[PDB]
Amino acid sequence: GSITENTSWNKEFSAEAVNGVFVLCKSSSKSCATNDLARASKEYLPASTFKIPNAIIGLETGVIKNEHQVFKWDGKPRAMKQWERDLTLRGAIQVSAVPVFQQIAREVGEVRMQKYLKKFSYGNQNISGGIDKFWLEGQLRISAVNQVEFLESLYLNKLSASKENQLIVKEALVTEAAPEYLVHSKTGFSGVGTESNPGVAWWVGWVEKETEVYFFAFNMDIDNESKLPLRKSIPTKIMESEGII
Amino acid sequence: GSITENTSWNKEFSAEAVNGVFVLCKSSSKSCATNDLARASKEYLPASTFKIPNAIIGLETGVIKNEHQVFKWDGKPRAMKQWERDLTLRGAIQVSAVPVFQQIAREVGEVRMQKYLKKFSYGNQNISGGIDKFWLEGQLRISAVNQVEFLESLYLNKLSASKENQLIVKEALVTEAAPEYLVHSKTGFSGVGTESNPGVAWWVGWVEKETEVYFFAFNMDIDNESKLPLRKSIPTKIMESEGII
Ligand SMILES: *C(=O)[C@@H]([C@@H]1NC(C(=O)O)=C(S[C@@H]2CN[C@H](C(=O)Nc3cccc(C(=O)O)c3)C2)[C@@H]1C)[C@@H](C)O
Ligand SMILES: *C(=O)[C@@H]([C@@H]1NC(C(=O)O)=C(S[C@@H]2CN[C@H](C(=O)Nc3cccc(C(=O)O)c3)C2)[C@@H]1C)[C@@H](C)O
Ligand SMILES: [Mg+2]
Ligand SMILES: [Mg+2]
């Protein structure tokens, strides 16, 4: 579609010394607005946002048997305590349980993963770097505009996957529910990288408000975990100034 | 499935002077508890809770084309200024827009409405009283045990309808979302009736918490719109009592 720059939105980045981009699209990706035309199409490691395509692929290949599959913890150390338990698919997405999705990816395997990222037009579609880590430290990259396009297809059930499996993943992604206000969303954080090679933090999703829908994707450069609150506050301020929130 | 009476729950009922029942079922043990086995099996006007089967039937028959159908307000006054606006299916359910569901019912028509309520085993299956009003002043009746059976089937996608259509109605029914706590629910209120033959107020739905699922159905006698808040107050206090929050 078309991407239109709104430089007034940089106010929210400038204040916090943040280098990043917000892409926000009403109704469709036919017309999106952004603070940074160039960065809106610049591609970055997806980190935990990749759990969305991975969940769809796991269901499509039958690796995830169905919506009520329980991912059992084997009792062995996992890198975060909140992952050391049995999880549903929703649970695994919402607590961002990487080892659940690593095992999903291993079972999907390289051939099938490559096939579905091509079907989904997902970023640079580059899965090299290890089947269980390409989206964590490999060569996979996707832009904020491309995240919006992917999530719009998911919203419309237009990905090349069953409608059932798109609906399953959508319910797992609900993060805020009010009578006329529904948010689907997913956070991501690649890590702190370095000073000269920063990590990336993401917030992607969509807002359904009355009869209208808004697709959004935010990323920022980050080299310190203490800046992570900005990954939600900057795009929240912008959507509020648009009267969305 | 089993059911057991827990007299202790009459606590929250006597306190605020209410005649009603709570049924709470843990999916993994296939075990339910209720304060009153007799009233758990008594059958009542479903009122707004019928919007759950009505929505599914509307989708199954194609009266509702799909999840992105907008129900346009025709500018004719409605009993609630909340309903005087375009609505998505989720919005119609969450705001409980009777006029939208009366029209759905009319388009489904008696023969098809009768068919699905039999397939769904929905209460006494008697839709006599007018195709657009059987569930609110007609003869249709359903018990709290029948509600949790029906909702358990919906959760499991085991109703005799498309998986897709069940998934659509399920997301429409989400009312609270946290990373490991997801609530689907629907309220109902038939009116004040008489103080001879009161009306009924419902709360039904289910809670997904970690990997457990709890199905619940509440109803109570109500003569005074005044006491509508206790429908949610009493089951919440019971569920809180059971560690479900
Ligand atoms: C996926 O990308 C990755 C996880 N994503 C993120 C993320 O926040 O996007 C984390 S952060 C990690 C999990 N919870 C801890 C935390 O500090 N969260 C935090 C701190 C301050 C603000 C916020 C917020 O407002 O969102 C969150 C540390 C994690 C790397 C994989 C591993 O799941
Ligand atoms: C459906 O049965 C019927 C509506 N159901 C409800 C209901 O509350 O179950 C009503 S009540 C009507 C709408 N909003 C007003 C109200 O007072 N709501 C209220 C009051 C106290 C507590 C709560 C709560 O915690 O949810 C809500 C009056 C309406 C009869 C219609 C949609 O078909
Ligand atoms: Mg990650
Ligand atoms: Mg650093």
Residue numbers in the entry:
A (entry chain A), B (entry chain B): 20 to 264
Study text:
OXA‐655 is a T26M and V117L OXA‐10 variant, recently identified from hospital wastewater.
In summary, the crystal structures highlight the importance of residue 117 in OXA‐10 variants for carbapenemase activity.
